[PDB]
Structures are given as C-alpha cells and as structure tokens.
Ligand binder design. Structure first.
Ligand SMILES: NC(=O)c1ccc[n+]([C@@H]2O[C@H](COP(=O)([O-])OP(=O)([O-])OC[C@H]3O[C@@H](n4cnc5c(N)[nH+]cnc54)[C@H](O)[C@@H]3O)[C@@H](O)[C@H]2O)c1
Ligand SMILES: NC(=O)c1ccc[n+]([C@@H]2O[C@H](COP(=O)([O-])OP(=O)([O-])OC[C@H]3O[C@@H](n4cnc5c(N)[nH+]cnc54)[C@H](O)[C@@H]3O)[C@@H](O)[C@H]2O)c1
Ligand SMILES: NC(=O)c1ccc[n+]([C@@H]2O[C@H](COP(=O)([O-])OP(=O)([O-])OC[C@H]3O[C@@H](n4cnc5c(N)[nH+]cnc54)[C@H](O)[C@@H]3O)[C@@H](O)[C@H]2O)c1
Ligand SMILES: NC(=O)c1ccc[n+]([C@@H]2O[C@H](COP(=O)([O-])OP(=O)([O-])OC[C@H]3O[C@@H](n4cnc5c(N)[nH+]cnc54)[C@H](O)[C@@H]3O)[C@@H](O)[C@H]2O)c1
Ligand SMILES: O=c1[nH]cnc2c1ncn2[C@@H]1O[C@H](COP(=O)(O)O)[C@@H](O)[C@H]1O
Ligand SMILES: O=c1[nH]cnc2c1ncn2[C@@H]1O[C@H](COP(=O)(O)O)[C@@H](O)[C@H]1O
Ligand SMILES: O=c1[nH]cnc2c1ncn2[C@@H]1O[C@H](COP(=O)(O)O)[C@@H](O)[C@H]1O
Ligand SMILES: O=c1[nH]cnc2c1ncn2[C@@H]1O[C@H](COP(=O)(O)O)[C@@H](O)[C@H]1O
Ligand SMILES: [K+]
Ligand SMILES: [K+]
Ligand SMILES: [K+]
Ligand SMILES: [K+]
Lengths: 342, 342, 342, 342
C-alpha cells in the first residue's frame, strides 16, 4: 500500500560532467508529439489567463507551441486557431474536454487547421477519458493527440494504448492547483515524469511535464527526468501577450492568474484558486531568460542535445539544507536578476 | 540516473573524541597547492568586492593568501600582484579566465611574481577549461596552478591529469550564487568536497573548498570532509580591507557584495546577484574569530594538525531538528557574540 | 521673531465654484519666464537622475521644458542642449552654478542655443548668487534667466532686482531634500509660493514652484497659490525617459533618484540623500494623468485659463482629520489608479 | 491658569535671509558662561553614559566642553577633572548635586582646577537648589557656576539672582526623560529657551539649551530661540569616546544610554529609562557633521556669528504637514547620510 518515496524539483540536483558544449552552442530542438517538433521545449498551458492566439503566436515565433484554451465558444476557438495558422504558418494547439458532447468542437478545430489536439483532463487514467481518446483516434487517425494528465507508469501505458501521440504528466503540482490538498491524491513531479517516461520511452512517445515549473532549473530537471518538453502556466501568466489587463496593486502591476478548476473559471468543489501574477513584459524576454538557464545546464552536464539531457544526465538527492545552500543565502539582496526574483 | 544522497554543512556534525590538544596549541598550518604552504587554511575569493592588493596583504599577514580578481586591466592586475610582493615578500595569487585570449594576462602576472595562478571557471570539467590548464602547464611547468571549479570525483581527476597543483571545489553553494536554481545543476558542498578529495588524496593534491562558508563551524566541517583549506567570499566581504566604500542603510553600515556572474559584474543570463554585506571592521579580527572556532574544534576532536582533522575526524548526520537544537533556541538574545550574529 | 504660521499642500483645499469650464476645454497654457510660454505648466528638475536630453525632448513634445543638469562636462552639456534644439524645433533649458568660474559653461550653453538659463542654488538670497545673476544679465542682456531658490517676498524682490526673468521657489520641500532638518531652515511650500508671488506679480515676473509635488492636486494648489508653473523631480524620476537603468528589487522595478546635495552627487555636509523610485513607464502617460487632474480642478473652480486659477481660486485651511478624509479611508484598496498609487 | 501655547523644534522653521555669509566663513564661537568662551556651541551632558574624561578631552579638542558626571567617588571625579586639565591645556566642567552635604565634593573639584561647576537638578526653581547656589557663590566667589534646570522666565530670574554664571534650560525634553509623562510637568523646549533668554539677556547671562536635540537643525533653532549653546546627551552617547563598551544586538552595534533619573542610575520614582544608542564612531566626526549643519544654517540666515543667529533670525510656525514635507518623503531611501539616519 505504501509504494515508495517520491520526489520533486527541490529534492534533486543535476550532476555536472565532462562537456564540450558551450551554452550558446546547445541545441534546444525537441519533440512535442511523435510527429511534431519544437525549437525549444516549452508549451503554454491551456488556461484562460495564459493562452489565446496572441500568446500562441509569440510563443510559436520563439520556437514553442501554445494550446488555445476551451473557455470560449467553438466559433471563437476555431477563429483563434485560424489566426495563429494565418500568422506565418505557425504551429498551434488547442484543448478540449474529455466529456461527451465535444465532437463538434474537435471537428471545428481540426477544420480550422489545428496541429495538435489536447484532450486535457485532471484524470487521464479515467475510463471515460481513455474512451474519448479511442474515439478521437478512430475519427481522426492522423491527428497528433496529446492526452493526460497522468502521474504513473500504468497511466502512461493506458494513454499510449488508447492512441495518444504524447503523454502529459502532472497531478496537483501547478502553482494554483489545490487537488492534492482537496483530494489527497497526486505524485511529486520528478517521480511522476520518470515513471511515465520509463514506459513512454518504449513506444517512442514523448512526455510533457505539466505543472510546478518556477525557475529555469526546474525545466532542466523536468527534462533530465525524461520529459521532452514542459508545459507552463504561471511562468507565462503575467506576460504582455497573456490574456487580460494589467491591474495595479500596492505599487505593482499584475495580471490575473487562475486555475481552470477554480470557481471563477468553472462558471461541486474547486481544485484551484484565483490569484495575481506580476507583470513581466514581453514573453520573448522571459523565454530568453528561461532558455538561457537551460543552455547553461546543458553546458554544465555536457548535453549537446535535449536528448542527451533527457536520457543521460544524473541527479543527486538533496535535503532541506542542500536547497537553502542552493538559493541565495546569508546576504541582503539589493539588485535581483530577471531570472531570480520575488 | 539518481546517484545517491548528498549533504552540506547543516546536514552533519563532527564527533568529539579523546584529545590531548588544547585550542591554543592546535597547529593550523596546511597546504594550498602541492608546493605552497599556508599558516591558516583560508583564502579569499577572486571577487571584485572581496580581493584586491589591500585585502590580499592583510590576509597574507595573518597567514592566508588572497586571489587578486580579474575585473581590471592586465596592467592593474600585475601592479596589484607586485604591490603584495613588495609588501614584505608576502604570497599572492591571481585569477584569470578560462577563455582563449588570456595568455597575455597570465604572462604579465607571472612576470609580476605571482605565486599561484588560479584558472577560475564555473565549469572546471569543460574541455575548454582543461585545454587551457594543459597549455598553461606546458608554458609554465613550474607555476603552481589552481583549477576548478568541480563538484565530483571525475572532475577532480580530470583537473589533476590536466596539470593542476590544486583542485577547487564548489558549484553553486556561494552566498550570492544562483547557478543551482538557474540551471538545476550542482552538488551539496560536503559531498562535493569528499568526492573530490577521495580522488585528489591519491595524487597528493590539495582540495580547496570554495563557497557556502557562513560560520566558523563550516570551516571545520569543510576540512574534515577532505579540504586542505577553504575559499571564502561573503565572510570577508564587508571588511575594511575589502574593496569598496561603506554604505549607510537603515541605521547600519554595509559594503557591496556581488557575484562575479551578476549583471553588474559581467558589464546572456546571470548566475549571481548583487547585495550588501554588513561592515565588519578589520579583517584581522574576523580571522581571529573564525580561527578561534576552528582551534576549538581541533581541541574537541583531538586533532593536533589540520591533517588530523582532514583525515581522521568523524561526522554524524543530523535532521532539521538537530540543526535547530544546534543554534541558539528558546531564548531571546540580547547580546550577540562576534562569531554568532544576524 | 516668530512671524506667522506657514502652510503647505496638505494644509489646504481649493474651493469649488460656479463653472462654465470643462476638463477638456480648460486652457493649460502659461508662462515659464517673462518671454517664454508653455503649453502646460510643468518643468523638469535639473538633476542627474531626472533630466538629460532624452527626457527634455519628451517633456517638450508634451508642452513643457526640461532643464539639463550640470553634472557633466561643459561639452557634454552643450551637445545635450543642441540635441534637444535639433529635435523637432523644441525649447530647452540648462542649469549652471552660481560658483564663480561658471562663465565658460554659460558661454557654451548660450552658443548651443539654450532658450533659458537656470542659475540654481539653494540660496538665491545669497549675495554671491545675486552678483552672478547681475553679471550674467550684463553679459547676456536678452538671455531668459531663472534665479532661485527663494522662500520669501524679499528674496523674490532681490532676484527680480538683479535681473531674473523668473523666480524659482522652494527651500527644502523636495522629496529627497533634508535641508530643513540639517539646517533648521525653510518655509512650507504654499506660504513660500504666495509670499514670493505677491512681489513678483507686481513685476509681471512668473514664479516657478519647485519641490514637494506628489499628487496632481499639489500642481493645482501650487498654481492657485501664485505659481505659473511647477518644477518636479521625483514625479518624473523613474520614467523610461529619465536617466539611469532599471533596478529590480524585491519583485518591482525602480530607477535611482537622488538629491543634487547628496554625497554621491557632490562627488560641508549633505542636504539630500539617495533613493529609488518606482519605474513609471513613458513620461507621456505620467503627464497625461497629472494634467487630467489639473483640468478636472479647473473645471471644479471655474478656472478657464491657468491665470484664473493662479489669481482667483479660493482655499480653505484643513486639519489632519480633513486630510485623512481626503485620501481613501476605511477600505482595502484592490485596484489602484494610475494617479493614486502606493 | 492656561497661559499660552508653547512650542518646540518640530513646530518651527527658520527663515532664510539676505546673506553675505558662507558656511565655511561662519564664526562659531560663543559663550558657555559669563566668563568662559567656546569655539563651538556644544556641551556634553553630565551622564554616566555620556561624559567621562575621555569624551571630555575629545570634545575640548573640538571646541566644546564636557561635564564630568557625579556618579563616582569624590576622588574618582577629581582625578577625572585633573586628567582633562593636564591634556593639552583643556577646559573642563563637573557636575554636583544640590543635595546638602555636597560641600566636600565641590572642594575637591575646585582643588582639581575645574573651570566650571554645574549644580544640576531637575528643579532649579527649587528653594533648596537656590540656596546651594547662594552658599556655593559665597564660598567660591570666582567660580563659574551653571545653575538649572529651569523652563521659565521667573526660574531664569531666580537662578541669576542667586549668583549663577549661566542658566541651563530644560524640563523633560530629553530623549530618555519621562518627567513630563510621570509628573505632567514641563515646557516645550523652544518656548522654554525663549522665555528664559528674555530675562537672562537683560543680565548678559548666557542660556544653555539642555535636551531634546536630535538633528543639526535643532542646534540652529535652539540658538535662534536665545541659547548661547546646547547641551547634548543622546547625540554623543554611542560615540567611541563615551563610556561603556560596545554591545552587539541584532547585527548592529550599540552602547548603553540611560537617564540619570532611571532605576539603574539611582542605584520616589524614576523619571528616565534605560536604552541603547547606535554606535557612531569618533566624536570628532559627529561634531563635524553637526557643526556643518549649523554653518549651512548661518549661511542661509545671514548670521555671521552665533550672536546674530541668537538675536536676529526669524521663525515661522509650521503644521504636522510642514514637518512631513521637511523630512524625506515619498521615496525609499537606499543610502543615508551621516547627518540623516534611521
Ligand atoms: N493536473 C491537475 O492536477 C488538475 C486537477 C484539477 C483540474 N485541472 C485543470 O482544470 C480543469 C478542470 O476540469 P477537470 O475536472 O480536471 O476535467 P474535466 O474536463 O471536467 O473532466 C473530464 C473527465 O475527468 C474524469 N475524472 C474522473 N475522476 C475525476 C476527478 N475526481 N476529478 C476530476 N476529473 C475526474 C472524468 O472522466 C471526466 O469526464 C482542466 O482544464 C484541468 O486542466 C488540472
Ligand atoms: N562556482 C560556481 O558555481 C560559479 C557559477 C557561476 C559563476 N561563478 C563565478 O562567476 C564568474 C562567471 O564566469 P563563468 O561563466 O563561471 O566562467 P567563464 O570564465 O566566463 O567561462 C570559462 C569557461 O567555462 C566553461 N563552461 C562550459 N559550460 C558552462 C556553463 N554552462 N556556464 C558557465 N561556464 C561554462 C567554458 O569552457 C568557458 O569558456 C567566475 O569568476 C566564477 O568564479 C561561479
Ligand atoms: N532647493 C533646496 O532647498 C536645495 C537645498 C540644497 C541643495 N539643493 C540643490 O542641490 C544642488 C547643490 O547646490 P547648493 O548646495 O544649492 O549650492 P551650490 O550650487 O554649491 O552654491 C551656490 C551658492 O549658494 C550660496 N550660499 C550661501 N549660503 C549658502 C548655504 N548655507 N547653502 C547653500 N548655498 C549657500 C553661495 O553664494 C553659493 O556660491 C543644487 O542643484 C541645488 O538646486 C537645493
Ligand atoms: N532636566 C530634567 O528634566 C530632569 C528631570 C529628572 C531628572 N533629571 C536628571 O537626573 C538626575 C537626577 O537628579 P534630580 O531628580 O534632577 O534631582 P536631585 O539631583 O536628586 O535633587 C536636586 C534638588 O531638586 C529639588 N526638587 C524639588 N522638587 C523636586 C522635584 N519634584 N523633582 C526633583 N527635584 C526637586 C530639591 O531641592 C532637590 O534637593 C540629574 O542628573 C538631573 O539632571 C533631569
Ligand atoms: O484548477 C486547476 N486545478 C488543478 N490544476 C490546474 C488547474 N488549472 C490549471 N491546472 C494545471 O496547472 C498547470 C499550470 O501549472 P503552473 O505552471 O505551476 O502554473 C496547468 O497546465 C494545468 O495542468
Ligand atoms: O556570480 C557568481 N555565480 C556563481 N558563483 C559565484 C559567483 N560569484 C562568485 N561565485 C562563487 O562564490 C564563491 C564565494 O561564495 P561565498 O563565500 O558563500 O560568498 C566564490 O569563491 C565563487 O566560487
Ligand atoms: O540635495 C538636495 N537638497 C535640497 N534640495 C534638493 C536637492 N536636490 C534637489 N533638490 C531640490 O528638490 C527638487 C525636487 O523635489 P521633488 O520634486 O519633491 O522630488 C529639485 O527641483 C531641487 O529644487
Ligand atoms: O533621568 C532623567 N530624567 C529627566 N531628564 C534627564 C534624565 N537624565 C538626563 N536627563 C536630562 O536629559 C538630557 C539629555 O537629553 P538628550 O540630549 O535628548 O538625550 C540631560 O542633559 C539632562 O538634562
Ligand atoms: K547559492
Ligand atoms: K544550541
Ligand atoms: K476621500
Ligand atoms: K524634504
């Protein structure tokens, strides 16, 4: 009944190794799905405070892909997909529910030229969800389909066998998620990525690490645990291109950020809250900061490619003291850096 | 892929043992490099807010050695080395980059009478860095050369085999460093010292523990894990002899302290920040405090020599509760001590 | 020798009156000097953290004029003046000292086409300052000269009698100034304006209210008290156009802002300090907000032009309680406004 | 029986005037007594946390005089006076009680060459204090005697009529004093000075403003109100030269500072408390800063000598808002100044 210990980002560090890679020469290309490549390993969450066309365009220009959220009419969703397609033949994705009734939406989104369809659910291992993956595969046998979310070996296998092109991993880790507290269920994200990747590696199916990314080092750790890219919410929330107006509070600027299972979003119990995230300027500058840290990791681990980081890098386990030593400590900071701040 | 647990200072304590050593009779002499001795096991970081000639002189007078930083013209660097040499034939060191183009600088510093040359890099296990160690060895076969930084057995071996006279250990532990967060890579300092020393002990090569020293007890722990001395930044920052003017803020005095990979220092992503450190008066008084604690450790472990502490002392692992018991607890402090303060 | 009570902004409120004026039909034009008009009643402080050519340009574009600070070589200051002169036909000022030896600097600035010359001093009623004004007026009979700073009727009188085209008013009210505290000398800014203006109005010489403006209401009050326009430092510090780079601190953005009598700026005791001011975006937007508050004021007072506000608006004296009532009270602010911020 | 409003420092500001005076040409000389001059207008408080021989010497060197406290044996107090007398030809004072039985102590201090004798009491208008002054004047007709403390014209009158060479002014304004709170008695320090001075000026007897000085502006105001010099306790407490050792607390340095009517000092109810004051360095440097602010004041008021400031400078009454305007406001201080500190 007690399966083992499980670990997340702040429980591990990566081991530096012999390297003939310099940061500016590391190759950040990776896979999102079996047949869709990315130039960087970053995708945006399908959240109404994160991804509509405007953010999807910016992110695609930088080499990632956005997933257009489903809190809008079918017509609006397809129009937003279309807009991204007609902006330079940029790749775009779109989410739909794992609930019956959604066939219309999927059709309109496929007709609109969507590159990758995401069946996002909080329980990718629900039979219901698997069934809707199977029917979607049968109806669209050449559509790249992302399923999840799962946190286990068996959950990944069940998704792969139902027909998905990629497995999405994460139950409960999101900055705004309260699932693990509200229900008591979830698995710490590093362990969850590795167990899922362990299985998915065998079908050549990529794993997307969704949730709980805060610092650029978490991106390196997620990928080294077996993920081919990461999906991020709070890190992109607050950018100029994210949906929503700037709000001024106590001398600062913010945009609204909320879980997709929060009361305001759902519009009988919520598994997310609503909050505010600091305004951060252009997404592009954030991506440069985040990829800067990753490139640097790849230099420190002698990882030439994302694949090298994903399959050959080592970790050590650390304690609470190890983590405090890792952050800045014993000094009063007077000038933060754009990749390290309150 | 998951190598093991790793530990830093606040995860361990040293075991008291039978002793015929009194604090005031302990012998603090040690080695910096294979052929350079120190009277105490302390060296100063090659940082623009820590070591120029003025601090290098004071520290050499107390029995350590300063490493003159490289953020100044070649001419200024050599003049600062010279100044330390003409101040009583005191020992001095100097840092250079591990980047091509630096041959000039090395030459000028050797001509200026530098005792020990430091190739400081954030990734001592980069092929590039090893190559520049090899060329420096070939060009100057009798120059004591320190290389690093590394955090592993294999990293130490690679440095020793490339020609270094000492191995420097530390990736990410520095008070002002954010490498471990920004990249996700690093190893907790105690484990890093021991793995490096494990290998280096065999070539008779000393290990320098660079970073994350906060209290005098960390010096004892670093040495007991296998280091022959420690390199310290924040502990010496703020002294009268450290570079920079005093700044008054909210009733207190400070000097600027910043990482050498911070934006202000580098003048595309930073792996340090900028901060302020409390003014602490004369370096000499700080050294007396810090060596006072070490001497006392050597009495409590029955260590006659640094070598005895480095090779025969024992540790125990402790928890978070163990560490809280170790600090002052349950009492409102009204009079701090100079070796224990906010 | 305790003539009278004296008042500043938070001591008074303006009385709403019969009006046929609307915010948008208010006429904002006014005088900076005897022979220089402005489209809006605002000038920038001659501080090295406020006005260089770039902010001078933006402010001119909007209807104001900037004063190029003197903390720079004569040639640098000249190129700055010329740079604004050639940017779209724009007016510009520059500041010099009343220190003897300033004759060469004055020449360059004049030869660079400067529209107005500020002789700025903390003590305009100083005989030495008066002489440099006489000497300057004799040498350049057609040069608009601003003299100050004064805080009295008799000091106003002395400056005008020496030849100034405008009297600048303010001793120690500045956000960053400590003169009142360190010397015990000065006059609350509304009384100082009215006293100076009583006199200068006899000569048709305009008064410039310099320092202590924080809210748009302060611009209204300063003008209703007698000034023809206001000079501001902190209100424009932190704008993109101001000199200095952005500093990230505790999750917010700032630029440095310091007094010209602070230790940093001096390189006798300092009479200012150094600080940081929230980054505010483009000056344009600050000016729009500020002037919106002044137009609403004019609409509330039946003041059609600046001159009507300056000579016919009435005031009431309030207590600390009236002031508490004037701010927001008894409610937790959740969304602030671009003209009302922490 | 509610004669009048009464004021202290933060109630007033001094009026800038026509000036041919510069800070550096200001003449700081003044009188402590009828027949004792000083080069600067500052004396030290006769407190066991402020003045012993060491601070007396430093203060004399700089142009002031210290009053040796009486919390010590008669012989100890004598050796203290003699110690200052033999240190470079320096003036010195010593304090005694108005308690009967003080005749022997007075003798020793006189025989040790004390230049001035302070009979200090919290109630100079006490008949017992008046008698001890008469008795003392009768016994030592040539001895400069300082009498006080008083807070009125009539109390000033009584002391002079008993034979004092100087009237010391202050009931309860001291940083560490609680007399006003515990007894309900006293007078705001500017009104108290002016009232006392009105009278003493009729006799050419100087007034000493004792207590409540915090900023250099307060020294200006106290002198403009009538005093010929100021007496300070907290402003010199915490200097190296003051008695007591340095206390480290919460990362800063302090010395103890306590009222002479506090429980600690008494070994009837206490009328002071005990506290700590920031360590400030060498007295010399404090005095340089303080007097720099006074010279700047003199330059602002056209006051060439102390006597011009004391008899011709004008004041305005301000509100809490004027006072808020006089300090730094609306900006986060990042570098304070040695004359303007938290
Ligand atoms: N990753 C997470 O931990 C997490 C948790 C909760 C919500 N969310 C997000 O917020 C939104 C909320 O919708 P939702 O309920 O997660 O999915 P959903 O789209 O409302 O439901 C889809 C399917 O999930 C299945 N399911 C089975 N048990 C549960 C359960 N206990 N809780 C939730 N679903 C179950 C069921 O088959 C259902 O039809 C989604 O967009 C998610 O991205 C994420
Ligand atoms: N000890 C640490 O954890 C650490 C980390 C970062 C910076 N620093 C300090 O700050 C300064 C910054 O310069 P730097 O970049 O560390 O060294 P550097 O002197 O700029 O670079 C020297 C060499 O490091 C090699 N390198 C390979 N991968 C990386 C990587 N991912 N990041 C950095 N270097 C790599 C490469 O061969 C390069 O030419 C140095 O003075 C260091 O002392 C220390
Ligand atoms: N407006 C204020 O309240 C205020 C106060 C202090 C400084 N400042 C600013 O800070 C900068 C520093 O210059 P500064 O200190 O004004 O003077 P300054 O620019 O160094 O000197 C100007 C002249 O002021 C005359 N002066 C006579 N007495 C005094 C006195 N007590 N204090 C100052 N000047 C006197 C004297 O003739 C001198 O040559 C300037 O840019 C000022 O605008 C402003
Ligand atoms: N300046 C002040 O406001 C103040 C107030 C309290 C104490 N102190 C200081 O603290 C020390 C303690 O001495 P002390 O308490 O002033 O007096 P003390 O030195 O113990 O006695 C001096 C004399 O004051 C006379 N006196 C009459 N009524 C009172 C009264 N209500 N309170 C005090 N004295 C009275 C009485 O003649 C007595 O002998 C001295 O060094 C004082 O300078 C100063
Ligand atoms: O309401 C919610 N409940 C639980 N998980 C959510 C909710 N909304 C979004 N998520 C998940 O949280 C992720 C973003 O996490 P973040 O990057 O830490 O902010 C999304 O990609 C979703 O998988
Ligand atoms: O910018 C930086 N990034 C990472 N490490 C740094 C940087 N600057 C200095 N260091 C390291 O931090 C050490 C000092 O650490 P400290 O003694 O805890 O302050 C130095 O000796 C360097 O090895
Ligand atoms: O160091 C200083 N001391 C006193 N006044 C200053 C100093 N520096 C600038 N000032 C004045 O303060 C003004 C700006 O005040 P603010 O608009 O309240 O920030 C300037 O126009 C100057 O008159
Ligand atoms: O215990 C006390 N009660 C009342 N006044 C005191 C006491 N101790 C000292 N004083 C007075 O307070 C002065 C110092 O005030 P300060 O300069 O504001 O710290 C001394 O010169 C005494 O006049
Ligand atoms: K660190
Ligand atoms: K303990
Ligand atoms: K209100
Ligand atoms: K002020």
């Amino acid at each position: 009944r007690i399966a083992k210990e499980a670990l997340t980002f702040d429980d591990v560090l990566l081991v530096p190794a012999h390297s003939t890679v310099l940061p500016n020469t590391a190759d950040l290309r990776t896979r999102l799905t079996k047949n869709i490549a990315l130039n960087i390993p970053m995708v945006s969450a399908s959240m109404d405070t994160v991804t509509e066309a405007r953010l999807a365009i910016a992110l695609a220009q930088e080499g990632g892909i956005g997933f257009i959220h489903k809190n809008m009419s079918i017509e609006q969703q397809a129009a937003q997909v279309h807009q991204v397609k007609i902006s330079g033949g940029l790749r775009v994705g779109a989410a739909v529910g794992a609930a019956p009734g959604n066939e219309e939406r999927v059709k309109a989104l496929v007709e609109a030229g969507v590159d990758v369809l995401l069946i996002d659910s909080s329980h990718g291992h629900s039979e219901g969800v698997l069934q809707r993956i199977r029917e979607t595969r049968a109806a669209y046998p050449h559509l790249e389909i992302i399923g999840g979310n799962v946190a286990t070996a068996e959950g990944a296998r069940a998704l792969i066998e139902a027909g998905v092109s990629a497995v999405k991993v994460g139950i409960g880790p999101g900055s705004i998620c309260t699932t693990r507290i509200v229900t008591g269920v979830g698995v710490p994200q590093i362990t969850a990525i590795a167990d899922a990747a362990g299985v998915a590696n065998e079908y050549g199916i990529p794993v997307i690490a969704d949730g709980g990314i805060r610092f650029s080092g978490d991106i390196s750790k997620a990928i080294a645990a077996g993920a081919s890219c990461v999906m991020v919410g709070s890190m992109f929330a607050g950018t100029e291109e994210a949906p929503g107006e700037v709000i001024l509070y106590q001398g600062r600027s913010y945009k609204a950020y909320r879980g997709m299972g929060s009361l305001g979003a759902m519009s009988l119990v919520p598994e997310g809250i609503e909050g505010r995230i600091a305004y951060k300027g252009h997404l592009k500058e954030i991506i440069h900061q985040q990829m800067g840290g990753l490139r640097s990791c790849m230099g420190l681990t002698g990882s030439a490619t994302v694949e090298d980081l994903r399959t050959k890098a080592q970790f050590v386990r650390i304690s609470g003291a190890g983590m405090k030593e890792s952050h800045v400590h014993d000094v009063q900071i007077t000038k933060e850096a754009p990749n390290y701040r309150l």
